[PDB]
Design a protein around this ligand. Sequence first.
Ligand code: HEM
Ligand code: HEM
Ligand code: HEM
Ligand code: HEM
Lengths: 142, 142, 143, 143
Amino acid sequence: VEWTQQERSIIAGIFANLNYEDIGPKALARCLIVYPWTQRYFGAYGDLSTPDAIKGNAKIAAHGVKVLHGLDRAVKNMDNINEAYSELSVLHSDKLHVDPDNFRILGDCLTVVIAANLGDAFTVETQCAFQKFLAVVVFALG
Amino acid sequence: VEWTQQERSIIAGIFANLNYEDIGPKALARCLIVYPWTQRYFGAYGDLSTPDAIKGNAKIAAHGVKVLHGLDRAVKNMDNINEAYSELSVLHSDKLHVDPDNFRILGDCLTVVIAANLGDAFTVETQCAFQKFLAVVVFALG
Amino acid sequence: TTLSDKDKSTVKALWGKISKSADAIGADALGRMLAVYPQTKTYFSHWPDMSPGSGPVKAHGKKVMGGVALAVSKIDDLTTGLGDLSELHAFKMRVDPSNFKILSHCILVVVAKMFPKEFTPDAHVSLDKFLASVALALAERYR
Amino acid sequence: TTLSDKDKSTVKALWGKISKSADAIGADALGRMLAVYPQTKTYFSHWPDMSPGSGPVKAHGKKVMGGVALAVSKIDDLTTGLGDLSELHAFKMRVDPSNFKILSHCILVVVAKMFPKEFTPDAHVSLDKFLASVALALAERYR
Ligand code: HEM
Ligand code: HEM
Ligand code: HEM
Ligand code: HEM
């Protein structure tokens, strides 16, 4: 976008704090549980029948961690998420045709997980910059 | 991708045949009536109380035609619509902060009014082209 | 989302006037969904042809407007009314909700185009509400 | 959007643990919607001060969670139960329906922030359903 230094360092701050092994699985699982239509894209990832089974799923969990590494890559590229995401965009929009509303919805899920995890570190200012960030990511995906 | 010849000629053709004073007032008024929260932006325009009033509103009719000339500008500049639209972008997004889904809505009311107008001429392929054009203007406006 | 008395008569009268062209509305609106909004092809990719007027679109367009008719008769309870098809779309097929608005739009366009004089702003508002209540009914079995 | 017996039970169980923080939740949620989604501020433009934790944000936040408290009371028919709140937001104020999802989202974030242990995926699906129902029921008086 047109980042201030404070936003850059808040955003890098959030992803320096997060353990992606914990956050990733939680956020993706939660996406699949709260918005089950997104299960459609994960037919190859084995067992998605109940919630308890979603959380127990190692393939879903690892994929949640890859989504965070994806995000982290966008934090390495804050001024060119578009370019940095081109192949991810070909993949989500040209190949899989995920409706843009879905990127929004997993973004939201992720913000809910990050909020639960960070507690008092999740200030208003922190969320403002985090959302600005996700809004660039979803535009880059679509 | 971007514009096929057949596409630019369909779009040029819609706008050459178009009877603005007919399509513009109709679409805008339809939008205010079908999606009444859009009325919020039109307090200066007087009587918006009934659909009968919206339909008979002279200010609303003039503005509907102004909308259509705003599209003509994208029509004349099909390759540079983002630039052509930057001031209208700032007006719509950075000043009025119209949620980007309303643009989609009005572009929907407009497709319906054009479909009712054109009848047999609003072929499948004409709709593909018009919606691809509209997607480009709404993105331009956001 | 809930329909007024005014809403339900409007849709009935309008459906009164346009039922006789049901198979063709379905087929044109479906045919238009798939060409104008090609992201929607994913759910229909097992068909040998998705092109406008092809046999599959005509055949299915017929069923979709079948379902529309049901809703019209079911208009006081779309939830129970459309239980089974919601089960099919929302649970079994997992059709993304963003898609129900696309087909709804395509149906109002074809209807405007076919019945420009009956497709009044008053009709539009009620038809649109109705197609939204159908969308919501269909979304019941997602979660 | 119909809420199951499980959804209502989940929401009421969650509300039983959280409700003594209702004022703090409303405040923190309104505050964030206005700062994180500054476009919602056009509705609050006559207010002196819209900033996180300010006097007006706190006073209004209480009201807003009083409205959620009200919906938990009316969960079997939000459509009627929030009729007056619809009148105000949809008919008088003409709040764009896209902003309800924003405030809903902000409330879930603050509940998750405040009660991370209570806010499981299971609480999350049902609270998100409930919030959508709240959001639909508030949209009743547009049209
Ligand atoms: C916040 C938005 C999202 C981000 C940042 C994101 C990120 C990613 C990343 C990093 C990958 C792996 C790319 C690679 O290493 O080659 C991926 C793949 C994938 N994403 Fe997403 N994603 C997002 C939203 C979504 C949504 C909404 C869906 C649909 C519900 C989805 C479905 C998939 C699937 C099915 C794959 C991999 C399929 C395969 O090749 O096995 N993603 N995403
Ligand atoms: C298809 C998408 C749209 C197009 C092409 C469009 C086009 C235009 C144009 C050409 C103008 C005249 C600008 C000028 O004089 O500098 C304008 C002004 C305006 N538009 Fe739009 N518009 C669109 C969507 C919307 C929507 C959805 C709303 C409201 C919800 C809206 C509300 C307004 C308002 C309030 C004005 C200002 C008129 C005044 O100052 O009295 N527009 N728009
Ligand atoms: C108003 C909305 C809709 C209505 C009333 C409707 C109605 C119906 C009906 C009556 C059937 C046939 C079920 C049977 O075989 O007994 C059907 C099937 C189906 N619908 Fe829909 N439908 C709607 C929307 C959608 C949307 C938005 C999509 C995805 C873009 C979609 C994808 C399908 C598919 C893939 C089938 C089955 C096709 C097959 O059997 O090969 N539908 N629908
Ligand atoms: C969960 C959804 C919502 C609930 C439960 C809610 C609840 C309430 C309540 C209880 C009131 C005060 C009514 C009274 O005076 O008796 C109120 C007022 C208001 N709400 Fe909301 N609201 C919601 C969403 C929204 C959204 C999305 C907006 C705009 C973005 C909004 C803007 C307003 C405004 C401007 C007022 C009146 C301001 C004033 O009295 O000075 N609300 N809301």
